[PDB]
Amino acid sequence: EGVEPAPWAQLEAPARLLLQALQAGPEGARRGLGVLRALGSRGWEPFDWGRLLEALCREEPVVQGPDGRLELKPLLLRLPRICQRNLMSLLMAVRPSLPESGLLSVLQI
Amino acid sequence: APRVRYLAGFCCPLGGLAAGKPRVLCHEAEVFLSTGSELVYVYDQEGGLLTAAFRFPDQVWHLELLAPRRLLYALCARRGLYCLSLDHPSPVIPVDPDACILPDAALCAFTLLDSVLVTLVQGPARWKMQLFEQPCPGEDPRPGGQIGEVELSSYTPHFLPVLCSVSPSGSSGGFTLEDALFGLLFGADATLLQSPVVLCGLPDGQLCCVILKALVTSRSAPGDPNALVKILHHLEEPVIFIGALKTEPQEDVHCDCLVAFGHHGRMLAIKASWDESGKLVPELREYCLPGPVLCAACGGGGRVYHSTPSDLCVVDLSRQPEEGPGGLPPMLCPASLNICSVVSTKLLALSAKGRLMTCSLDMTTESAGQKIKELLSGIGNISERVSFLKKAVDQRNKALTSLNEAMNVSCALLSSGTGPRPISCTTSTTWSRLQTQDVLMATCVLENSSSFSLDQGWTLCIQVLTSSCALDLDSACSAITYTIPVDQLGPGARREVTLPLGPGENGGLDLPVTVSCTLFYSLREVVEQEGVCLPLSRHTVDMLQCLRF
Amino acid sequence: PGLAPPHTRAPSPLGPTRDPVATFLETCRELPPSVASIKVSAELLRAALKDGHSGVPLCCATLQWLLAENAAVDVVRARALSSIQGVAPDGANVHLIV
Amino acid sequence: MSSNEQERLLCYNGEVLVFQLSKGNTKTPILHVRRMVFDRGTKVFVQKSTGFFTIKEENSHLKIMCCNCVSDFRTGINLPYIVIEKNKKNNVFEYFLLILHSTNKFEMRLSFKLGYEMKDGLRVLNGPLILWRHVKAFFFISSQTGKVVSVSGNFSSIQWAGEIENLGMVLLGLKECCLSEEECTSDIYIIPPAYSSVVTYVHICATEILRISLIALTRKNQLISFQNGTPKNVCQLPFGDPCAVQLMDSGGGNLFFVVSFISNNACAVWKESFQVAAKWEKLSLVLIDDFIGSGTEQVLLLFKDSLNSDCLTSFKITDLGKINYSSENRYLVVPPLETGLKVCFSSFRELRQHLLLKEKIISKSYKALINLVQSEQLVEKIWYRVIDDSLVVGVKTTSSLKLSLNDVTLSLLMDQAHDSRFRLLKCQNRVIKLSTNPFKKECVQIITAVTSLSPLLTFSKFC
Amino acid sequence: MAVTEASLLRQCPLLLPQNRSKTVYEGFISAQGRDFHLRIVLPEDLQLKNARLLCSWQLRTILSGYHRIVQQRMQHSPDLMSFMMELKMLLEVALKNRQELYALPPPPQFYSSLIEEIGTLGWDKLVYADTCFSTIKLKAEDASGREHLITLKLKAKYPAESPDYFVDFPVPFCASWTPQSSLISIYSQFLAAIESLKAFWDVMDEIDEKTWVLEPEKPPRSATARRIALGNNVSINIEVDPRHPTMLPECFFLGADHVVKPLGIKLSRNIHLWDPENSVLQNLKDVLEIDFPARAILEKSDFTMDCGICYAYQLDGTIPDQVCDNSQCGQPFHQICLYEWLRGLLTSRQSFNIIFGECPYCSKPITLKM
Ligand SMILES: [Zn+2]
Ligand SMILES: [Zn+2]
């Protein structure tokens, strides 16, 4: 009745692993940095971040507010609010090495 | 690497060959071919020369073959069934009527089991299946005594009906099903007897089975059909091809699904389920393929090689059980009708033209650049035509939109909302002067109040009905009619038409005169008898409008 | 029609794009505005319009005298219009200025 | 071409047969067949087998007259034929019909031995049946019969010749006239005599029961459809003096008419929309078949022998779609394109179904309107006459419709497709009661309209 | 319009009411220049609390993972009009997400122009092209002789809108895109960025050669960080500014508090003798008054032997104990961290004192016994 899948279910393994990590209270942020060093280490050295920053805008519907309202939400407002703050903190720290096109899709939201 | 070839082509008529009648079988390397003429040919598949040509009389309707005995059974139309020894003691050969056996003459279909022969013969109203022996010793080639006979009472009458036998596991040119299925379709009896069951496809589209064991009768003992023949499932359209398929494939293969096909293209595959009630249930699936279907076959692995008039297309069933829809590719061969499937895939067909054809299915500098050039040229040929179809689509859309509005106007008009809002048509009397005489005119004002723009396809008809009470003497002019195209009326917008009603003849106007307007929609204009006529107003002109002070 | 008293939706006639016999023949077998003007003495026009009906001396009274014979002159008398856009018998438009 | 040293081409069984006379020195020139097939590997035609035939008597002027696949009457198998003229300079010409077999082996079937030289419309037909003319004297020799026969009727040209269901052999020379070749002499639903003056070549395509669907093409470089003599879907052809149309199918539905012209040039035009898809020039020849083994038609286009004194140089083979063949990585791009190629084709094949679906829905909705509004025939039938400058339409009632109870009228309504302008149409209504043989008993009530005609004949025509 | 008599025509042109009582609509519904068959039966009154809605199997593949959405919308939506808005909006969503299945490019511009333009560049340049032709990846050379790659992800219109450029090197890359610009143009911009960052590259390459760079392994060109080892069980991590590479970085030391303290003191004392006319190494060696080990161990350099969730050794006494039953991961964990982790997954099931489920890094079966 109340099984829900995690909203990063359908993602590329490494970003799934990043976002699984940042879930983890305020040590989310460092975990994240740790996560990226331990993915530089492994076979797929590059992080095509704009794969993820596309993914972070991509919408789906949710039904909240009154018992009858369809809305469209992007990812960014859908995954856990602690992952939101820990994400942006990690982006600050990684700002230089992001494509601007994708990055400004985030900030619009 | 030539995935097709040609062996021969034939005397085709205009269009091409008529479907159902022509037949092809492959034995080993010899191939047996009838073009729905009186002529049956046999070709060496190594070298595409004819071994043998056989002139019968009158339009061969069907062949079958027994490999062991090296014999071919062949149904002439108004003559009976002639057997040919392939040994057979110009490369044209007439058959002598000695080769005739059961000159029944009225026989339309027939099939073969082991040691048993089945015909199916037209009569009066009732069609009768029979069942004869066929002598198991290598004798004089005989029928024997008919074992039995029935009347397919169910059927009362271009399309020949068709016959397929189906034996169950344990026990030959037919098909074997699996014990689950066999028991599922036919019942315990045929399971317990290990009884072959013979499926007839009927032009009705009814697909009837009969148990063979259960058909042995005499003069003393006639078969009751209500007992003895039963009826699986009624496709509403005639039958073309019956088979069965090895879904779940994990020479004698024991199939788990039963296949029909139609002319217009309902298929019906059937399966065993044993699901959701701890009980065996049948899995029906009435798909809808394209077009006229013109033959069919089966290849290894739930792959049915069929033909429409445009294209030779395949369906896969192989995996609830089998499948939701059968979405179904070409293989970019034309309408061949009359197909066969030898299993190794190498299929042989007769093309609609007259063509006997074998379908065998499964870097460089600057030559690759020329390949690149080729591919570009291809897409550009193609693109041109995708474009055309886009614009056709736009036409269809624009048509739909106009129609959409038409329905909406009509619906609005035909509802009584208590004020005739959408379109109005008022008329009003006016004296004028012509030449000398005071003429009485009617203005017809058409007004669009609503949003709906009355586009093309619309026309106003006015009719001016005189006096009532049809008389002793039918008048000169009973009524007059006036019909005008309304073009692009639009909302708020307005037309006016003036008519006389007035004394042109005789100084004689008879008063209580109705002028009634209507609209009519023509569906054609924007691209059985076909339009609509919708009433607007009907105003009566009486003396009190026609006075002048 | 635009100037008219009622300001009523009358459909624009648009006189026939060809003759019926011309359309017959085309079927069976298969830009600036032109202008004219005049000038004339104010003294001549004054002396001739004196018996002087009313209103603004010239252009309006000139137009009233040109169309004194048209039925729709009293409407132009009211609005006192020195330039108008009529149609025609053959459906073409014509704009006449004074 | 036609000489002692020259060839002619033909296409049989997805291959190309080249019949060449060769002066062999003891003896006369010999007919040599090459039977050639497209390799697909080496992107050429390669010689797969040969045939030969020794001619006897030492007289010159041996000459190929035509070639094609015919269908022998004995078997029902298509065999290439060839017509040889043998000329002894004698005011005598032999005219052999030879049929060459599966086996690259020859068989005489006519000697036929005329005095006067044969020219204009030589036309070979199924039961190997030669048919010719001089001075408007049409003659035919069956290989059954073996004797010269004359055509009973008198015609100008012989525009189509060929076999139909129920009839056996036929000729359309004048568009009325429609012979048998058994009892020489239906002309009812052939094209109008209007088109009779402009039609120079016909190509029939269907016959049903009597109803023919048929192409023409004219001196005006036009190309037209007909379904029960109903001219739909006209074209215009780029080049001048069109000779012939053959047909291509080239896939699911991609049907073309490939037109060959006297000017050594050719069109293909796409049925579904009578439109030039493509044009080529100088076209020594054209041939229509599966040279590849795809199972669907290509067209061979041959370019001129000005290049080499060698035949199947300067070729071009196409579908006019996916197949095109002809006479630094880049390779990572190739599978991308081939994926595209197939995808374009995919989208084609879907749109066609999509569009049919729209047509189906449109029909649904027509019928929906008519059932929205709402069995017994209230009305027999429609009839009409022209009086002088009066159209009279009339319709005959049935007993069901009672003019005692029902004021009726009748209108006429003009097709706005024709009537681009707002003409009002006026129609006068008359009711006619005639007693039938009074000396129950039949009364005949009919209802009828009249209007002026000359207004409606603005466009030569109306409905 | 307001009312769904004109507003419904305007907003669903191809929904033709069959019945007079507008109960059955039938025909097409539009989305992204694509029309879909849709047949929408109402009850005898206009109540979507009970309605039928059938579709083409085309549309149903495309409403997969939306079924409950639409059924709730039928029940929750007041009018048909708004229902159609919601349904189109949801189709809008569905297609743009599944963007892999849906792209009919206009060939006459596309596939020809792209060929012309790759000819304009030269054929040694392109290194990968995707069979959907969406992705390409190109190569460029330094005066040094280093390859640097550029991915482009391209839309239905290449020459109209920008191509999405995805790039390694650590400063944000700028491509001035016009309709007039082309592959050669953006390629020349990319070469300009290469030749500009030449100094930073030489710094990185020089380091990786003449020192035991330890933590980033097979370094990308984006990485500014180099955890260098020196002596034994002490390291220095060094984060560098590309714009001023030779200049001083933010730096600090890992290892033994008694070993590191002297180096920190010595660094604070010589740090005024940083000089951006030398190299980074030629400044570090004479500032810290030391030479480095050039791979004191190249085989067993270091394997990170930390939790791989919390990345600590010594979480409250506990050690990296629990590992992966895998040759390719081998990654140690903690008892606490791995329990908290696996409890949370949907893939996990718990027996009596056992938890089965996926290793975080490699997604292979890993077992935890409390
Ligand atoms: Zn831990
Ligand atoms: Zn692992």
Q: What are phi and psi of D110, to 5 degrees?
A: -135, 140
| CA gap B410, B494 in Å, rounded | 19
Q: How many Cβ atoms are within 10 Å of B332's Cβ, its own excluded?
A: 19
**Helices and strands: H and E segment counts in chain D:** 2, 29
Closest among B468, E259, E368 to D406, alpha carbons compared:
B468
Tokens of B476: 């000169």
- Alpha carbons C71 and B147: distance in angstroms, whole number: 107
Sorted by sequence, the CB contacts under 8 Å of residue B135 that are 6+ apart come out as B141, B142, B144
Tell me how far the alpha carbon of residue B350 is from its chain's centroid.
21
E strand intervals along D13-55: 16-22, 30-38, 45-54
Distance CA A59, CA E91 (A): 12
Q: Which residues pair with B545 in a beta bridge?
A: none
* Residues paired with residue E318 on neighbouring β-strands, in sequence order: E315
Residue closest to B455 by CA, chosen among B428, B479, B423, B498: B423
Amino acid at D104: N
Decide the pairing of beta strands B162-167 and B175-177. Answer: parallel
Beta carbons of D460 and C24 less than 8 Å apart: yes
What is D169-208 written as a DSSP string? S-EESSSS----SSS----TTSPPHHHHTTEEEEEEEEEE
CA D2 to CA D20: how far, in whole Å? 9
Do the chains contact at E37 and D357, CB–CB below 8 Å?
yes
Rounded to whole angstroms, the Cα distance separating B81 from B73 reads 7
Question: Do the chains contact at E9 and B372, CB–CB below 8 Å?
Answer: no
Touching chains, E (3+ CB pairs < 8 A): A, B, D
Nearest to E108 by CA among B62, B292, B390, B48: B390
Interface test with A, best of E64, E68, E76, E151 (most A CBs within 10 A): E76
| CA–CA separation, D433 and B462 (whole Å) | 25
Instruction: State whether residue C61 is helix, strand or coil.
Output: helix
- Within 10 angstroms of residue E369's Cβ, the number of other Cβ atoms is 10
d(CA D297, CA D319): 7
**β-bridge pairing B92-94 and B50-55:** parallel
Are D256 and D286 contacting, i.e. CB atoms less than 8 angstroms apart?
Answer: no
Q: Where are the beta strands (DSSP E) in D389-456?
A: 390-397, 425-435, 443-452
DSSP class of B372: H
Contacts of B372 in chain E (CB under 8 A): 115
d(CA B492, CA B423): 10
- Cβ(E228)–Cβ(E236) below 8 Å: yes
Cα D296 to Cα B359: distance, rounded to the nearest angstrom: 12
What SS3 state is found at E128?
Answer: strand
Across the strands, what pairs with E109?
none
Q: For residue B125, what are the contacts with CB-CB under 8 A and spacing of at least 6?
A: B156, B157
Q: How far apart are CA B466 and CA B482, in angstroms?
A: 14
Of the candidates D336, D337, D312, the residue with the CA atom closest to the CA atom of residue D325: D312
- Compute the distance between CA of residue E226 and CA of residue E214 in angstroms, rounded to an integer: 7
Q: From the CB of residue E159, how many other CB atoms can be counted at a distance below 10 Å?
A: 15
Tokens 């550029």, residue located: E150
Q: Are B327 and B316 in contact (CB under 8 A)?
A: no
Strands B532-541 and B513-521: antiparallel
E strand map for B260-386? 269-272, 282-285, 303-307, 312-316, 336-341, 346-351, 356-360
CA nearest to B302, candidates B285, B284, B322, B287: B322
Q: Which residue has the tokens 């197939």?
A: D342
Identify which of B258, B309, B245, B256 has the alpha carbon closest to the alpha carbon of residue B286.
Answer: B258
Size of the B and C interface in Cβ pairs below 8 Å: 7
Answer whether B510's CB lies under 8 Å from B467's CB. Answer: yes
| Measured distance CA(D371)–CA(D100) in Å, rounded | 64
How far apart are the C-alpha atoms of E102 and D419, rounded to whole Å? 45
Bridge partners (DSSP) of residue D106 are D100
Q: Tell me which residue of C96, C93, C98, C97 sits closest to C1, measured CA to CA.
A: C93
Q: Looking at chain D from residue 414 to 443, which residues have their Cβ under 8 Å from any Cβ of chain B?
A: 414-417, 419, 422-433
Task: Give the span between the Cα atoms of D317 and E80, in whole angstroms.
Answer: 56
For chain E, the residue count is: 370
E299 CA to middle of ligand 2, Å?
A: 22
CA-to-CA dists, residue B406 to A102, B397, D34, D366, D462, angstroms? 48, 14, 67, 10, 25
Residue E132 in tokens: 């959907």
Helix, strand or coil for residue E358? strand
- Of E342, B301, E21, B363, the closest CA to residue D372 belongs to E21
Q: Which residues are C83's β-sheet partners? A: C97
Answer positive or negative: Cα dihedral of E319, E325, E330, E331. negative
Contact E187, E125 (CB under 8 A): yes
Answer whether B546's CB lies under 8 Å from B429's CB: yes
Structure tokens belonging to residue E21? 């009582």
* Nearest Cα residue to D337 out of E132, E157, E158: E132
- Resolution of this model in Å is 4.2
Query: Which H or E run includes D383?
Result: strand D379-386
Interface of D with E in 372-431 (CB under 8 A): 372
The tokens for B240 are 């073309």
Contact state of D332 with E124 under an 8 Å Cβ cutoff: no
**φ, ψ of residue E273 in degrees (nearest 5):** -95, 20
Nearest by CB: E9 against B325, B372, B405: B405
Are the CB atoms for B323 and B342 separated by under 8 Å? no
Q: How far apart are CA E305 and CA E301, in angstroms?
A: 12
- Under 8 Å between Cβ of D66 and D124: yes
> Which tokens sit at D376?
């017994």
Which of D10, D11, D12, D13 is the mutation pick for testing B, counting most B CBs within 10 A? D13
For B27-172, strand residue ranges (E) read: 30-34, 39-44, 50-55, 63-66, 71-74, 81-85, 92-94, 100-101, 107-112, 116-121, 128-133, 146-149, 162-167
Q: In sequence order, which residues have a C-beta less than 8 Å from that of residue B471 and are 6 or more positions away?
A: none
**B537 token code pair:** 């107003």
Of residues D63, D65, D52, D47, the one with CA closest to residue D24: D52
| Proximal ligand: closest to the CA of E331 | 2
Name the residue among E128, E254, E147 with its Cα closest to residue E194: E147
The answer to whether the CB of B381 falls within 8 A of the CB of B32 is no
Residue entry with tokens 């007693």: D435
Q: Which chains touch C (3 or more CB pairs under 8 A)?
A: B, D
Q: Residue C75 — φ and ψ, nearest 5°?
A: -65, -45
* Distance from C-alpha of B457 to C-alpha of B522, rounded to nearest angstrom: 5
d(CA B83, CA B72): 6
Helical ranges in D145-296 per DSSP H: 193-196
| Phi, psi of B49, rounded to the nearest 5 degrees | -85, 150
| Residue E50 buriedness (CB in 10 A; 0-12 / 13-18 / 19+) | exposed
Which of B362, B403, B438, B443 is closest to B532 using CA atoms?
A: B403
Indicate left, alpha or beta for A40 from its phi (over 0: left) and psi (-120 to 50: alpha): alpha
Cα B243 vs. chain centroid, distance in angstroms? Answer: 20
Mind giving me the DSSP string for E14-83? Answer: TEEE-SSSS-EEEEEEESSS-EEEEEEE--SSS-TTS---EE-HHHHHHTTT-HHHHHHHHHH-SSHHHH
Instruction: Tell me how far the alpha carbon of residue A56 lies from the centroid of ligand 2, in angstroms.
Output: 27
Is residue E178 left, alpha or beta, with left meaning phi > 0 and alpha meaning psi from -120 to 50? beta
Write the single-letter amino acid at B513.
Answer: V
Tell whether D147 is within 8 A of chain E (Cβ). no
d(CA E201, CA E150): 17
Interatomic CA distance for residues A90 and A33, integer angstroms: 7
What dihedral do alpha carbons B323, B327, B333, B335 form, nearest 10°?
Answer: 90
Whole-number Cα distances in Å, B72 to B95, B341, D172, E89:
13, 19, 43, 65
CB-based contact B357:B4 (threshold 8 Å): yes
Bridge-based pairing state of the strands B254-255 and B175-177: parallel
DSSP E252: E
Are B63 and B20 within 8 A, CB to CB? no
Experimental method: cryo-EM
Asked if D355 is an interface residue toward chain E (Cβ–Cβ < 8 A), one would say no
Residue C9 at interface with chain B, using a CB cutoff of 8 Å:
yes
Please state the φ and ψ torsions of residue A91, each to the nearest 5 degrees: -60, -50
Contacts of B75 (CB under 8 A, 6+ apart): B60, B61, B62, B63, B81, B107, B108, B109, B110
Assess contact for B38 and B56: CB atoms under 8 A. yes
What lies within 8 Å, CB to CB, of E46 at 6+ separation is E22, E79, E80
Classify the C-alpha dihedral D63-D65-D71-D72 as positive or negative.
Answer: negative
CA-CA distance, E193 to E140, in Å (whole number)? Answer: 11
CA distance E174 to chain A (A): 9
Pull the structure tokens for residue E235.
């390291």
Helices (H) and strands (E) in chain B, counts: 5, 36
Amino acid in the structure at residue D446: I
Whether the Cβ atoms of residue B189 and residue B195 lie closer than 8 Å to each other:
yes
Distances (CA, A) of E104 to D342, E99, E111, E133: 12, 11, 12, 12
Partner residue opposite A38 with nearest CB, options E308, E344, E363: E308
Q: Could you tell me the two tokens for B13?
A: 């008529």
Which regions of D146-304 does DSSP assign to beta strands (E)?
149-150, 160-161, 171-172, 199-208, 211-218, 222-223, 225-227, 235-236, 242-248, 256-261, 265-270, 276-281, 285-289, 298-302
E215 CB neighbours in chain A (<8 A) are 37
| Rounded CA separation E226/E237 (Å) | 6
Structure tokens at B449: 């109040």
Question: What's the rounded Cα separation, in Å, for the pair D312 and D304?
Answer: 10
Q: Are B152 and B128 within 8 A, CB to CB?
A: yes
Name the pairing type of β-strands E135-141 and E147-153.
Answer: antiparallel
Say how many Å lie between the CA of residue E330 and the centre of ligand 2: 6
Angle, CA B375 vertex, CA B373 and CA B376 arms, to 5°: 65
**CA E218/CA A40 separation, integer angstroms:** 8
DSSP B428: E
